Nucleic acid binder design. Sequence first.
RNA 1: AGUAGAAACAAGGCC
RNA 2: GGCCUGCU
Lengths: 98, 716, 735, 249
Amino acid sequence: QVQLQESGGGLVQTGDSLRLSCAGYTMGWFRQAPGKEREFVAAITYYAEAVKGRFTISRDSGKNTVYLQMNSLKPEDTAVYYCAARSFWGQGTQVTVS
Amino acid sequence: MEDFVRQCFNPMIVELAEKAMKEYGEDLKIETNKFAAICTHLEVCFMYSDFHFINERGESIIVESGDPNALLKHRFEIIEGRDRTMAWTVVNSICNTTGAEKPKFLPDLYDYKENRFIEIGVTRREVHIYYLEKANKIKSEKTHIHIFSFTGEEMATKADYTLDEESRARIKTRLFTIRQEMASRGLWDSFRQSERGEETIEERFEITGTMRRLADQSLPPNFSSLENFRAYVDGFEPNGYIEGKLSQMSKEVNARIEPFLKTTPRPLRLPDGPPCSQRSKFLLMDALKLSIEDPSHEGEGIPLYDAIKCMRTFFGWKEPNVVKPHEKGINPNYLLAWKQVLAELQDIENEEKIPKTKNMKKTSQLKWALGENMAPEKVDFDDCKDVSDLKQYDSDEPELRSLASWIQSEFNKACELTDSSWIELDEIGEDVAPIEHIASMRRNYFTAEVSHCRATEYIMKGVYINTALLNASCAAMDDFQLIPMISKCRTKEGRRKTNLYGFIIKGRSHLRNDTDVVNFVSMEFSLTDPRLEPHKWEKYCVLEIGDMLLRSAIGQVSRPMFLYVRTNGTSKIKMKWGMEMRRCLLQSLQQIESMIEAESSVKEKDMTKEFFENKSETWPIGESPKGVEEGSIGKVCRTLLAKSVFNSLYASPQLEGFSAESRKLLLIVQALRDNLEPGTFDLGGLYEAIEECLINDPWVLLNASWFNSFLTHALR
Amino acid sequence: MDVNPTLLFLKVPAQNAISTTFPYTGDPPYSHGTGTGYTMDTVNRTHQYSEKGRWTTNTETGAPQLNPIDGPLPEDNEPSGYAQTDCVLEAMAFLEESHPGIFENSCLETMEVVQQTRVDKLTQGRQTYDWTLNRNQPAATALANTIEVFRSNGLTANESGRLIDFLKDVMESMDKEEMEITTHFKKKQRLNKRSYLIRALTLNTMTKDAERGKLKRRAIATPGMQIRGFVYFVETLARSICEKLEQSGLPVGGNEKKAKLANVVRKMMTNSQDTELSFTITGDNTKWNENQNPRMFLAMITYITRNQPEWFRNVLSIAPIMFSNKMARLGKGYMFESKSMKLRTQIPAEMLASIDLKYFNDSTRKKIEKIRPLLIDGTASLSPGMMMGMFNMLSTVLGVSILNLGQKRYTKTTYWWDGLQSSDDFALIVNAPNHEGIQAGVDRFYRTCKLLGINMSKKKSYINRTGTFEFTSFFYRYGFVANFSMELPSFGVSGINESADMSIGVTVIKNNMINNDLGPATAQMALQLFIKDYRYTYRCHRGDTQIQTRRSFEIKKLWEQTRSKAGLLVSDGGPNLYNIRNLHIPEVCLKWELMDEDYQGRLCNPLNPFVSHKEIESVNNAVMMPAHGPAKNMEYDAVATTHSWIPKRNRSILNTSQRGILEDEQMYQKCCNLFEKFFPSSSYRRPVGISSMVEAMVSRARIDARIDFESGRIKKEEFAEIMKICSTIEELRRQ
Amino acid sequence: MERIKELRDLMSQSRTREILTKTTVDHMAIIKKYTSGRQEKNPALRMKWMMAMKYPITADKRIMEMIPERNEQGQTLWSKTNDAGSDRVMVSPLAVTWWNRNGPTTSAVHYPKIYKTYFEKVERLKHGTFGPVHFRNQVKIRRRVDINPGHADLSAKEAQDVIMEVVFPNEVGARILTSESQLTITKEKKEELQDCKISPLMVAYMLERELVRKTRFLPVAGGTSSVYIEVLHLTQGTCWEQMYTPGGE
RNA sequence: AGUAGAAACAAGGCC
RNA sequence: GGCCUGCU
């Protein structure tokens, strides 16, 4: 019943900024690096230790969208960023920081 | 509204619903709410059936995703989503395998636990009315029915709900998703009531475009359009128009009846020209027989050995020499061919076992005699256009030839008795009914009458020769083959006997069309000197091959013994029809039996025995210089048999045309003789139609002469 | 003394011995080469019988057409095609008045049939002229090729499976700028509007063989597939109409024809009092088909279909509209020979338009010179009249209208006439108080016939007193007399197969005994001769003989192996138990109780590799073209034995550029066999629907695996294997 | 198992896959009759011409694995060269006779039950009693009479549904037969032919022949009964009448 | 040459 | 010389 599509990923500079958005309940943003399983990023608010202060999660319940505003990006943020609803998971949007 | 089915539902369901849309032939642009409603019905059918599996137990195993295994059985198996033909296929198959009752309408699902059908329908209206509605639509149904409705309520008879309740929560969540999504869309101005059961269509077959213009050019001369002509026809009523044109039409258009009197019919004119020649494929009146007196039956035996044994029975062979040339060929080739045949016959006699069929060498002699490598080579027109001699095939009326007296004598002696029985009939089921006994006695009488007849001998000769020729042509297409003319008879004493008239050499017979010609060369012994009726042997080459001594009171004759050699040809159709010459017996004896039955219908008793023994009654069957001569019924049998045999031997288009156009005049003459005031519209036309069939065929000319004689004797 | 069979007629009346005048024991005449000469002669003759008409040039086909309708009235007794529209409309109106409700009813049933008819009905036909290849091919093949071309061009309404939709697509094809066809030598060729119009309006001409009763050969025609549906509907209407007319005799058999002839003669003569004289005319119509203008058939049908739905009128009118513009292919061509250079050549007929005339004789030269103006794209326009009895039933309707127009209510005179009409032949009984009355009646009948484009052959017709006449080789002399010479050619081996030939021969003997008054002894002789010919044809001799053949060894060992040798079939070298009492019993059942169980089981074994059954229509139906008649089919009683094999096919396709047709045949047959194994009722009832093959086959595989597990051999392992194999073929069809 | 397997094998090759995909069910008949073989104009001529060849008949491929390629003396029985437009192979007529002397044997006890019409004819004739032949003119008048003596009072279409439900119970479709006569006929011919393995098509054809009424116009004199018309050739003639009473009466 | 009769056969095509 | 077809 809940389909999800992520937007706003891509190639970015180190120290640059990126606004992920997921069009579709509580919502989460999770990430997967090429050599690992799922990592918690944010939920809606709470953020993981590796991304706190840099990244902000927000939602518009009238647009049915959850946003992840990433700033001051690091090469270690390079991952597929997946949106999730709470059992329902997006396909993920590639973010590559360099 | 269609944007909703663009957006939400998966492809699979939308094209399933589109094919269901095409099923009953209505268009989607006029009313789409039906599409959405039935696609939601189909969706609930899937979502209710899938995700539900069973194992060897009952108690369905429910898995969110079917794992790789043999355990992929589906709890509910879908009915709809298929064509009507297949839906009823599944219905009937389930009924015949489950032993359940066949519903009259379409169900939606089948289940094992309860071994029965489910007809799922989710309607806009509340359940507690739609349920019993569809229930009274379905007669005396044991298939359990279960329906939802948008408010979220469920119901069913027996208070029965056949599977998990979380699935039903799924169903109603799906349901209210639909509902409060149209809420964003806004369709209930018609969603509750959008279909009322409309079924109507008008068939449209419109003439337009080019095909209309063609219709405008297929009218009477003074009409401009199909519309105007149809309007005129609809407005047309009979007002005496045939009478006006009949009065205005010229009076020279008439069908005046010319009276037909005794002095009206004139004798048919026969063509004039060189005498008529012989056309038969074998000698009929001038045949000679070399015999062995063996006990073998017709088909029993081997041809070559029998022929050699028969020929060794004759002594007095002389070196062959020309007596009467072909007048158009190379007679030395015929002489050399005869000597070659003799030499190769001896060659077979020497070796171990006589071969069943022999092939001959392809020498220049038989290459010429059989017409080999004479067909012009086929080429293309673009390469042969400047050749002055290049023209059509010769296509003109055949050469004209006048009748000769030899065909009359040949027919005369074709109806004469013989000293042998030339028919050995097959077996039939033993007669059980008295009518069968009467039939058998009649048949025995006719066989006794016709077996000793030259017509039967000709029938057997033709049948055997054509059968052998066809079989050899079909088997040995390439190589020249030797076939001795063999016919087996039975003497008065009862001893069986074989007879060898001569030999046939078949040539290349690559026959594709029914008209393609296979050429052969025929050699036949005889004693009739060809120096007395040369015009009858225009196409024959006749040699002198020996002397024969037949016991006669005048010392012993020591007659000459000649060989008639000629090049002839046939075709697949001719061979097939000549191998069915035995139906001449039928034709003739059917005619005689019709005579007997017609006469016996007068006197209430079978009249066969007295007809065949007393011989009191006689029919006109020929004319002598003294007058018309009548013969017994047996002579009529033989005469009709000979007529049929000659029809089968000298068959040609001339014969058919003359037969038809002379049967017409015969019927007219019969009407005259019956005092029925016959009349004709154009008798000269009929006469010209008859006279154009008489060109060169001896048989048709003889028939025309017979017709003239019949007219002369009739009309008195 | 000189023997003369004809003198036999001096004692036996002509009709009581008419069988002697039928030389049907020899080979019938056959044509040998091209039929182009006959086609050209027929075209010229049809055009010159209507010379006084008016000429026009069609704006679509660009061909010259001659319209004689409403032309000058004839002033001579020569054949004339100048039919008058008003006269024929009045004749049809009188026909309706004498038979109220005929047209409306017949149109109602025809409308039902047309709107419920299917496309497959067109496959039930003999050779048809396929325009995709410009040659005659079996009806099914031509229909399939045309459907394929239409679907490739974008005309897919025929997918509805309705013949009316197929005709809609056919007409829509007429308005297309450019169609595409396929040719093998594959090459895609483009046909413009006019070329396709002429290819759809053309006819293929051939020479008729095995035609007994005339010295000269004739030409016959075969139409295409675009026009056969309209012809089918028109002939359905005409048959429904004629079935309501007792004066017609075309849609019935022979015995019904005789019964109606007897009834009409008795009615005419019996009602006639002593004062009225009666005369029978045994009339034949000269150039029947060449003088019947399709425009007049259009007029007749549009009068018949008055006050009917316009679509019905249009669909029934399309056919005569196309016949009025019909074209005829000249034929195979002409073959030339050069003896000086010793060669031969074959020029196609399409070159007759431009080829010089130095190669042709005077007659052919003049024929070509006269027909050239009508040559358009290798085919000649034949608007003036029908070619060969395509509208038999409508012609019979016109003749019946003429016959009924003299019911004494329209004659307005003492004389009157009636009779029976079957296209190209008629018997006319005319009564009148005096010979002058009879003469006037016959004269007026002839004149009225000439006003409808129908001519009476004065050379092949004669009039006598009633009680003696002829009709279609049936000779009536105070009662019909049997002939038995017309059925003589049917007394041999038919040529289907062993069991079929045996059953057909015995059944033919039986029927000719019932109908054609064949005698008992004659029937026994026929049985004996047929058995002899059958054994000599199939190399199946009695077995106890020493006749060495290619099949005499196995037969002899079977003979020596069998204990009760009386049960062996004649096909296997056994005795013949047939007789007059057993002519209605199949051979297998007559010898069933005498066969040994081993031989009986070996013979009638379903697993035999010889028996092959295709459809319900071709189970025990044999098509025997009767002598002096159209092709006919017969039901023959036979038991499916090992002798029911089907013979070898032609096999000459392998040397032609059309060699890929055999591969397509094999693939289609493989798919059809697979479908039949999936759908057992495919043969008995032809399946219907709009889905595709693989959908039905895969879905039925699903269900049948399911249920045959729910009871049967299948197992879970196999059922799941089938389910996932179905999924595999599904994803394969995806890609 | 097998059936879907040759289905998959067919779909493997592109041409047959296209034929299966684009061809609709309705066109089934057309493509099934799609053939280059013309219908013979003169069957007798060619049957008399073909039988003189070696390998003149045709048989299924399976013959190559039931009958040896040659007999005792070496006369060939079958060839491996296939027919023109079929997978069947051309074989000699001896392969027929061979099959009747050493071919596989079965139990033909049920053929009498299938071919009911012909065996009923045989039984009727076997117990018939003939009588004296009376010679007198017969006034043959032409009448419409029923030839089939076992017709169950059903038309072609009327009995076609019965035949399908008896043989093809699953392809019946909408129709469920209402008339109880049809019910009893279905029951009887279902329990009687429950395992007969002759062929579905021939069984259906013979059921159609037996149950469907058929009528033809014939010249008759007396009789007029169905049983008396099948022997019309034996009881009535041009000038003779043969009294007969079939075994049924 | 021969068959046959309003046009054909008296082998065809492919290498 | 070798091979193919015999209503296409």
